[PDB]
Structure 1
Amino acid sequence: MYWVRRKTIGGSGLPYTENEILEWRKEGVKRVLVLPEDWEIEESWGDKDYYLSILKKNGLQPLHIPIPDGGVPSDSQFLTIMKWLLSEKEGNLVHCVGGIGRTGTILASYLILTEGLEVESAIDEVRLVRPGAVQTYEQEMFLLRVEGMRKSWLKNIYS
C-alpha cells in the first residue's frame, strides 16, 4: 500500500490474506473504502460479505462502493465516497484490485476537492507514489469534471 498524504489517505490493491490486512493496520490504516465489484472480491475471498466481515473483525471500518474496472463512480456514489472520506481525516485506505486505476482516480479526486489542485497536478501527485494511477480516458474526464464542479461538490457534501 502507499500513502498519497501520510497516514491520512493512501491506496492499495486487494489483499490476498489476512496477514496483508494486519500489515495495513500496522501502517496506520483505520478505515477502508472498498472499490472492487463483488466478483473481483470473490476471486480472493470467496464471498464479498465474508471479506468485509474480515476487515471489520480486524478493526477496520469498511465501506463498499463497487466501481467497474476502468470506470468511475456515479455522481451518487461519489457523494457517498467523499462524505465517507471527509468524515475522518486519518488512516483512510482506498483499494481496488491492483491499486492503480479506480483507486488512483478516487485519490486524485480527493486532492482536487480538499487542496483545490488542478486536475493535472492531482494526477501527477498520485502517479508519483503509484505509477500508472488513473488508467482510462473515462477516469481522466471524470477528474476534469471534479475540478470544474469542485464548489458544487463541496456544497452538496456538506448539506
Structure 2
Amino acid sequence: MYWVRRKTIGGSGLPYTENEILEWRKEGVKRVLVLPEDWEIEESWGDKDYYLSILKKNGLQPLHIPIPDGGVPSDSQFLTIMKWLLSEKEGNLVHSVGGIGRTGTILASYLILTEGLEVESAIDEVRLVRPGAVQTYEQEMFLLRVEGMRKSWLKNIY
C-alpha cells in the first residue's frame, strides 16, 4: 500500500486476507474505492459481496466501481469516482488487482484535475510511489482525454 498524497489518497493491490485490511486501517485508510471486477474479487475471496462486507466490518466505507483489467472507467463511473474521492478528503484508498494499472490511472486522473497537472506529470507523480503505474494505451488515452476536458470535468465535479 502506498500514499500518493500523505494520508489523503493512496493506492494498493487486492488484499488476500483480513490482516492486510487491518493494516490499511492502521495506516489511516478510511474509505476504499474497489476497482476490480466481480470475478476478480471472487477469484481471491470466494465471493464479491462477502469481500465488500468484510471491508465494512473492518471499519472501512467501500464503493465498488468495476473497471475491466487494463481498461478505464466510463464517463459516468469517472464522475462518480471523482465525486466519491472528493466528498471526503482524508484516508482515501484506491485499489485494483495489482494496484498498478487501473489504480495508477485513477490516481493520475485525480492529480490532473485537483492539481492541474499534464498527463505525463501526473503519471510521474504516481510512479514516484508506485513504479509502473498506468499500463495500457487505453489508459493513456483516457488520461489525455481527461486533461483535455479538464474544465468540463471540474464544472461537473463541483
| Structure-1-length-normalised TM-score | 0.98
1:11-60: CA deviation from partner (whole Å, max 9, x where unpaired): 00000000000000000000000000000001111111100000011110
1:68-116: CA deviation from partner (whole Å, max 9, x where unpaired): 0000000010000000000000000000000000000000000001000
2:24 corresponds to 1:9: no
Aligned to 1:119: 119
Aligned to 1:71: 71
Matches within 5 A, 1:87-98: 87-98=87-98
1:89-144: CA deviation from partner (whole Å, max 9, x where unpaired): 00000000000000000000000010001111001011111011000000001001
Question: For the residues of structure 2 that align with 1:32 and 1:40, how far apart are their CA atoms?
Answer: 16
Question: For the residues of structure 2 that align with 1:61 and 1:84, how far apart are their CA atoms?
Answer: 11
Unaligned residue ranges in structure 2 (runs of 5+): none
SS, match of residue 106 in structure 1: helix
Extract structure 1 runs of 4+ deviating beyond 2 A. none
SS, match of residue 90 in structure 2: coil
Number of residue pairs the alignment of both structures matches: 158
Aligned to 1:56: 56
Question: For the residues of structure 1 that align with 2:86 and 2:10, how far apart are their CA atoms?
Answer: 14
SS, match of residue 125 in structure 1: helix
Identity %: 99
Give me the CA root mean square deviation: 0.5
Aligned to 2:37: 37
| Structure-2-length-normalised TM-score | 0.99
Unaligned residue ranges in structure 1 (runs of 5+): none
